[PDB]
Amino acid sequence: SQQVDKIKASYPLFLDQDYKDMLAKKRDGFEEKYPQDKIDEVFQWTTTKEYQELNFQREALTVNPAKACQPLGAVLCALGFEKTMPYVHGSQGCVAYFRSYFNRHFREPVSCVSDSMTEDAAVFGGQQNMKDGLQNCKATYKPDMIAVSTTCMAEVIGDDLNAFINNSKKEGFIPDEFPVPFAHTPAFVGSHVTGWDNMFEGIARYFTLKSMDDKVVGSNKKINIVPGFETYLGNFRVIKRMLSEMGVGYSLLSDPEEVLDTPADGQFRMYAGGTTQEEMKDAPNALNTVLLQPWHLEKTKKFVEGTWKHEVPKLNIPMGLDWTDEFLMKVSEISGQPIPASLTKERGRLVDMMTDSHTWLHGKRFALWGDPDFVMGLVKFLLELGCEPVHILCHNGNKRWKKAVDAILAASPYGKNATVYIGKDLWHLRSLVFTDKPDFMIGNSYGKFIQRDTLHKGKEFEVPLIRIGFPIFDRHHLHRSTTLGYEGAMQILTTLVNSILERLDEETRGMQATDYNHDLVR
Amino acid sequence: SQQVDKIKASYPLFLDQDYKDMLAKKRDGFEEKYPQDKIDEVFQWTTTKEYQELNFQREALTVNPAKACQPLGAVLCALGFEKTMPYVHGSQGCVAYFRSYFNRHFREPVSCVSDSMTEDAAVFGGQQNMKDGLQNCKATYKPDMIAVSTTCMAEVIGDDLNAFINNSKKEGFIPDEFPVPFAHTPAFVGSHVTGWDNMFEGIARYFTLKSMDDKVVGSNKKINIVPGFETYLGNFRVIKRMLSEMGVGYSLLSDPEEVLDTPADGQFRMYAGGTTQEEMKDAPNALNTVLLQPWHLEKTKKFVEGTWKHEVPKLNIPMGLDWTDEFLMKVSEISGQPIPASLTKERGRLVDMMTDSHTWLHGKRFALWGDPDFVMGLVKFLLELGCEPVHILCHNGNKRWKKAVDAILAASPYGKNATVYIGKDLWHLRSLVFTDKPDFMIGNSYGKFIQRDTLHKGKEFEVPLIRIGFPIFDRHHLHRSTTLGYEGAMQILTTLVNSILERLDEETRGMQATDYNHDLVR
Amino acid sequence: MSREEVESLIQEVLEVYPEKARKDRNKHLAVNDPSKKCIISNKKSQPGLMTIRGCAYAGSKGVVWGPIKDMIHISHGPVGCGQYSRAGRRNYYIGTTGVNAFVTMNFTSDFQEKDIVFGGDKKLAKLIDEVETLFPLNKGISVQSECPIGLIGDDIESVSKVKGAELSKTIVPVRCEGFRGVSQSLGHHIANDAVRDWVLGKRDEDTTFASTPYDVAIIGDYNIGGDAWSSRILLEEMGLRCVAQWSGDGSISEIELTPKVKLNLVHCYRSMNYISRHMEEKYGIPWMEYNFFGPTKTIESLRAIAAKFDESIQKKCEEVIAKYKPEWEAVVAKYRPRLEGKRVMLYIGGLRPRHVIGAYEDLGMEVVGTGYEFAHNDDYDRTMKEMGDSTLLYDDVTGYEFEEFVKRIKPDLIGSGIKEKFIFQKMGIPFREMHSWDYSGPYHGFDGFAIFARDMDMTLNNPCWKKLQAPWE
Amino acid sequence: MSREEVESLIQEVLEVYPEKARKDRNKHLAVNDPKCIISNKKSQPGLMTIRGCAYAGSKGVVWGPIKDMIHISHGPVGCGQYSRAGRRNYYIGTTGVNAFVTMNFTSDFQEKDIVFGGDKKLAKLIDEVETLFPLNKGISVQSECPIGLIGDDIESVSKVKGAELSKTIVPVRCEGFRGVSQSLGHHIANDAVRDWVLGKRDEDTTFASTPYDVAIIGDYNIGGDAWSSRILLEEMGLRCVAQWSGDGSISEIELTPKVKLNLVHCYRSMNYISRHMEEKYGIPWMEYNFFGPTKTIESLRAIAAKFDESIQKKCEEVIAKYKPEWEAVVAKYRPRLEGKRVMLYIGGLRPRHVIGAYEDLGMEVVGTGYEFAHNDDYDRTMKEMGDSTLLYDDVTGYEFEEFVKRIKPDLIGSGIKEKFIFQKMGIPFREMHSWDYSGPYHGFDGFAIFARDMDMTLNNPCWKKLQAPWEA
């Protein structure tokens, strides 16, 4: 039954009595449901420490992963170049998923094609699909460049991308000068961030390898900035903003900021901005190249250092107070430009905010997860605020990274109760927050089901989630936020402190029970 | 009983059994408290419509007002001028409160002095306090200027500020050319926004009234911007940001942006930035003057139009899509500068966020309060988003403002169930959200006790608060936000939609009960 | 507007294609006129034309098997497939996720290179053991094959038979590798046959289930936002007893009990007609198609279902229609005057492009164009009847074609999926998601129609669409 | 800390003043030696004093915390608004029904109330309070500035309306212009309790007394400070009949004439009504201090001596029970705070009452001072403070900054109008008014919190980050 006065959607429609009894008869009649008291006893068991021990013995099963597959990152890297179509050689289902995943996070169009390799290509190779695919894409969507990656199908059958593209140019399917860089992006290796590294390194060598004789380091007096797999629009913009304030010439290679944020003005724009091909050809002439996320750019680093002959500085991600300083000081040293007064003040303002909020941040225990560079910067910043990163999880982290983070924790008293996990997933984390309860989680939208599980155990065990990461599906426009630089530090601080305060307000709202602490001024 | 490794502050310390029993024995034996069954019956009575009718028949008692007194706004206006010391002629207890009130909202130093008028001054006037006060201030804190307002004590005994200041310079307590603007700011007239109006009108008079002989409108090719009583730092910044992008010469008269956001760099700065006296003296040479909050700048408009001979355009506060548009177009017409593609894009991206989120905003019912100009822009923006401002409350609103707002409501189908209240307080609003329950409240930190009262009746009756306005005491750094222009609209939009979604997540987090609607994607 | 324009528009769009794709695409676009008659479907996608189609793994894991709640479904292969599809479709269910239900969870074997070289069967058996220690209340396991499973010579059936007999548990191997077929379509068929060969026959010699002349099963209703719950209430208010729902909120036992019902109500023909035809051959159970979109189709479908029984069920059917009559009439009275005459374009999967037209017309709207991602020729035969003359029809439309068609026709509303929503919102065209119901719904039944009408109104008549152009160009 | 240094510092700070204020400020700055300072004098105009007014001392301090009474801010809208929920006098109750502490009741004076008087409005107001809050147990009328200057007569209204409704209406003439500080607000408020509420039960004989009955006087329950103290005395065997006024009721206060002992925590704010009850009811009163373990141990025993040997035995039980707790607090936090110097500036009690708690953590108080203390308050401070420590009365903002610049203390304890000044300078800061939204600090349970709070702030990592690594 519906009142046209107040229409009810699924919630709370199915709480009406007539729907409630029906679902009860459906359960009792045909579902062969386990007794509720069994379900409770089992749920309790899944929160215990014995279950955690079993949970951490898993070798073959992965439950609720915290990572994606390579081509996802290759698509995102390719969208950052001017008027280029990301092109995924393989089966079409991947592309349908790649666009959907990004549509939901950015709430924007995400253009990407496939050459729809099918049953036949699995036995004869996908060379024909590559020929007609490149010709079809180029004539239909008129891009100036086509960046090719692979699905795991195309990798298993061993399709040689280099030959397939070359024979497409030899036979006249695309012009011989039309830019078509490529990268093998196997889904069974690494994660989505490796796909970003592989794609960018492949695009780099396409414009750089057979032209180094005319290049001299520093002649264009600029600094190359490689952002890596980045899904916050503010992070691209805060890098460019600070570099413009310093008067530093820069090239942000892979800049998807415009295409992921086109205006709604009665016209669809498939392409927008991005790094031009001219900047990519001139990048070897830069003073140096900075890697904002070096822990998943190692392939690119070795190419930049080896072929461009750029002395890539050893810099952590510009997240937090110290690492934003070292970043600005390195950029100053390379470019010769002094750090302007506007950034000195901004740093101080972030410091002022830490002083006004340290009483509520001190001692708070956080579980967190995400990609390697993002996780270690968040760990570093948490320590700078006096917080305890109790459970640190990075599904796609390596052991060299874990030792780097373990040394960051050892260099601070607030990392004493901290442990770093690698190769584990959110089902592992679900146990850690039950048996070693933190105060909050910091992660992507998938952590919402962990908070739902903690609350089922009881209100006093609920661990609220703080949505900082990728993907964020159940909130709107958080992708516009910033996490890099001082500006990103201020937003995160604000998000942390106020999430703590909103939880206190909720716990102390009980009239004549806990509201004695429901202070107006906090 | 405290456990050294887990020390409990007030909450949850007083939940322990020995405290709960001791508080129960205090009540039963000494407090002679009413029986809970009675106070439960009374609380329920206070949520009925019968109680609301008695509540709204008040005329002598005010409960939880949503306004302050004039001098509070005069101090904030004065803080916006370069090296200016706010100075309020009267009793000192007011300055203790004015500074404390602003300290807690901005979490910054707030410098303001009194001349400490006592029983002796009440029966003989405060002339002597003014002479010693001004002199003690000028030598001790070395301000370039001292802006004098009044406490309600000094207004009742009829102190003549103009004479007292002139006598102070006559007798050599302060130099004769030392700028000492003054305004009468009686607390029993209007509210804090009126104190802002009176103070700015007085400072403009001191610097322009005698120098009109050589002023020609438009000679400096600038536009004057009067912000009014403004407590968001981003609102000053965003106005100067858009005007800078338009290449429009502008003069922001009263700019406390620097003083209210000084960096923590090992030294305390009493003064910082602000409008210079040179800009105030040259203000009459501007092409025109724009009033960002015209509904409490009545006096300033009369002076600007009567003495500077500027045609102050009829512009609403630049809040929301339509009014930010009219604001830029008016500035474009006056200055001759075109609206640059940067602002055309930014508007587009705001529109894109509206289309992306409209499905969650549509039909959502809001109660809200605050100052007249801020409230009318919020109502305007809410209608543009498809929301229904059911209860609109402005304690310090006047009758012609209510008619203006009622006209905006009638021009949109989403204002069909709206009612504008003036002269009512947040105890009137408490009844309204009980008898005509909206979905959320948009107001200051005083609304947290209305959410606390709605929750006591029942979880399905709780009305969560969305903190936009002044003062905000129980959250940190929200004073850095923006509510003006497209940027402000984007933050308000994000705040609203994500407030709706986190409430939906909370209501559908029950396992096997409502979590079927605990969607990952929203 | 009509005939020579729409057909000149179709050749207008196609002039930009290379000849090979142009010739193939020409046959997938057509104009209506109420026997392949005018359009082919279920063919290969042209490479590099930005298809909206998914794979066969999406059609089997994300569509048919995923919604089964008391089973654990494993994405066998690399980590990509199960992750992008985790909780992507709103097929609702009642249960305790992680204890006795697992729909929104993502179980995977997460293939590393070591398993591409050595095969992944030994790991899969080891995975099944870990699943059983950690999720003891699961009532079955399905193994959804991703692309590499077939290309490396793995045999998931032997692992399923050995581990299934060892643990005395139903373990369903599904060879739904993404490269098979041309779309999600074959995924359904592969999944249907996997239900047949491994689940459906488990209780053929069991006789303990007490049947009744009114036993009935809902086939092809995946409970998007409670869609199947909005349909069940109407059928059980009619006196019927619904023994199973496939697969929305469905259980393993509801599937095994389906061979005992008297009638199979097929909502989604394209994805479930395979198992329906088999259940009529093996068990003699007849199956009919029905439509619960809008009051017109729902009332028509309710009466058609009642005719298959006795006069009592027919007399309850008219008591149900009368009880909801004031409700849906108030819905029409309030919202039709706001949506009358507005033209809508649709592009969805395999059923809804035709099944919702009746609901739109009940609100006085007109579908000037529709089309399917992956439908077959018999789907387009049913579509011919449901739409007017001179209306546009497109099969496996390309991103370019869709955009071009919307620019010329200027429909007032578009209904499609997430990969199209933000394209047309920037173009100023109101848009409703017709897969996820834009996180609203349900849209089935009478209670769903109220939501449907409210949802079409709030979007079409939202004020945000008036503000797309700046008042200064 | 050389003592010719501090005396020369006091000197070369006052050279900025004009002579009139320099001469008066010179008498408000002194270095001690355990008769050299004057206080409770007029604030010099225009020097940014931290002082409040007599309305703050009466409404915001003494009366406000009384939870079942409705306190009316009589006058313009400002005073009640800036003080609404400003200080954390905690209470148990149902706000808006039977309790009203955090609510703001005001008469919102307009121009026609200033010219015509506001006594007709005050009488109609009291009616509106009675209809909309029937469970209130008394009304107090706190006068803001204009009430006394326009010749209003709140008492005649209070006496007329009091008899008409058979309800106790307390007229308080605490206009902010009276006195020099919040201090006179206390006194005016004390005299208003004495004359309008305290004698209510002089006739009554129905309260069953007890030789161990006591009442706490001058603990306003900042963050539960009174609750954290009451627990310690009730476990000692005593009976606390009343808490003035933290989480206090009118009935509790009315029954205070029936105790055997009055334990005053805050002397400066409650000594007035303490002496009156010794004169009128013979009830003795004694000072004590529940800040830190040393002063709490010392106080518990001193209080026990006023009774028999049962209590003195129950006493030593209490001391032994919490002995492992506070000793664990010290072992954990003293090595983190040892040897660090604190500068204080608070109101009228805590500038000397918390000295013992800082010493139990190994810290030293190189300077302290009061906003509004009298000379008898400084007499007690001479004993608690060490040699050659700086003392200041009604310190100006300029003085307070210059003192800290030279002395360079490791942590400053003051109020909200100073916190963000010294934080930007790089000196840790703890609010000693609101406990910086922490607490309680009274008793043993409070000492744990107190110690954790001084440590989290002083040794917070944010303090070593004030200097940009490229400005060095």
Ligand code: ICS
């Ligand atoms: S199953 Fe099919 S694409 Fe019949 S794969 Fe697809 S929940 Fe569509 S038009 Mo998404 S044949 Fe269902 C469908 Fe229709 S996922 Fe849903 S909306 S009625």
Ligand code: CLF
């Ligand atoms: S068509 Fe379909 S979705 Fe594509 S892979 Fe194949 S089953 Fe899967 Fe999976 S893992 Fe990442 S998304 Fe692919 S490339 Fe390998």
Ligand code: CLF
């Ligand atoms: S010393 Fe006097 S009683 Fe004390 S706090 Fe000051 S008025 Fe009040 Fe003032 S803040 Fe505004 S100007 Fe008047 S109402 Fe109130």
Ligand SMILES: [Fe+3]
């Ligand atoms: Fe968008």
Ligand SMILES: [Fe+3]
């Ligand atoms: Fe600050």
